[PDB]
Amino acid sequence: MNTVPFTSAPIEVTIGIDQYSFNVKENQPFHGIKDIPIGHVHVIHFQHADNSSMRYGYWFDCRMGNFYIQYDPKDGLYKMMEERDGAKFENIVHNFKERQMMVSYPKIDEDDTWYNLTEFVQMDKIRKIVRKDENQFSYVDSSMTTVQENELSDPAHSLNYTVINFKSREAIRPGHEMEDFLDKSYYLNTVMLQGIFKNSSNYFGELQFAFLNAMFFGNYGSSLQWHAMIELICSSATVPKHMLDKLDEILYYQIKTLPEQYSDILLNERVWNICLYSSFQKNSLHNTEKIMENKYPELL
């Protein structure tokens, strides 16, 4: 069990850790989050009481270092940082626990939600999507744009998701125009899986990470990427059986976890109706299809 301490909480802010969140009052004595499960990525995120715009936060993995949060009054936000003095850090962490000024990561033991949402997400891959290689953790916020969005301005702050585009030379073999456009198996399996992602797990990892960024920060370009990667699978006639069964589980927990009130902007009617009901894989997402009908039948 690992800990992320906070130096202080100078401004009123809603703090989230993974799918949980807590309201912290201005200069309330809050000094971190303990009992964070080792073995998964995590994200700590923030939304200031005074600006319900720009949700922001940090992806990290506690096996990669000792991390903590400090408010910066110049840049006006809670910054994640790394403490390299391991002794000095256990010291801070032990005094804050003894004084009991830390919340405990509130995992029910029956609950595999976070595992299911992050099964294929790896810190090393996140750091290639969010390039900032002097930090071991990754900053993301509501307004960051993706590489694809940029192409249609500041590349230091871009989400370098893999560009997917169904009407591109990459996607369409010359001479198989119609075949490849109507059956994206070529694009999925040869270009993307064998070519770029190398294996299905890295593909799923980006898909899950895109979803989480859309859910936690309302990052619109991430929602575009999550939908694109679903559609590419559902629009392929030939998909490894293990990917379909796994996709059904991935999507199920994503749909389960979305806040009920956000179905409008986060869920693309066209993609879902096409995937669940028109695509080659209409019959391969039984759990996802069942939870979508019983929770958001309006969209469909």
Added chain:
Amino acid sequence: GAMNSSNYAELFNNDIKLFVDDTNVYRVTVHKTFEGNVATKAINGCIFTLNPKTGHLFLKIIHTSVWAGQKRLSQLAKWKTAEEVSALVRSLPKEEQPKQIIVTRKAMLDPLEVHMLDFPNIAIRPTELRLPFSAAMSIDKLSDVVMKATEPQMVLFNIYDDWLDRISSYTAFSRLTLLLRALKTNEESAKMILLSDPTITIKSYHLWPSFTDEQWITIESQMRDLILTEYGRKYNV
């Protein structure tokens, strides 16, 4: 963006553009089989690719052999249209390639867009105009060359005959679309109007009769009158 009444004069500027109409690419007759079921028989069709500024028509004849052993032919027809249009552009020298291609049916955008991926600077556009180019097979010489073909064939025409020697492209296109609107609404009458006077002939290298200027005014009035009548008949107005 889409082409409509507002930006209608863009058709006659000096940017090369082509209309593509696919309505007559996949043509069937519907009939009863011996056991009483319905079956189709394909007949020869054509892609109607037209430069509205110059009159140059690229009539690509689609031979029934294209369909042999193929499923979902109505869908395939869109991709074969896009294939042939793309091949036509490739065959044209660079300075003759269009800057825009306007498809008369929106279902053609994705097939053509995909086939034109090698020409990113050629814009593929839909139109809100309700153009009458499906009536192209009502022009006797076009219908004849399509039905007689024994293999795929590109036949070139000027759909304006020699009109541009005396009128502008705008007026020429308005005349063409009026003639075709008429032929579409009531072919028998439209054609009666065009040939009533046997002393007005069609040159061997033309599609339409060699009307004098004054006779074209009378023709166009007669075609307008036809189109209005049929409308009151259609809607009881």
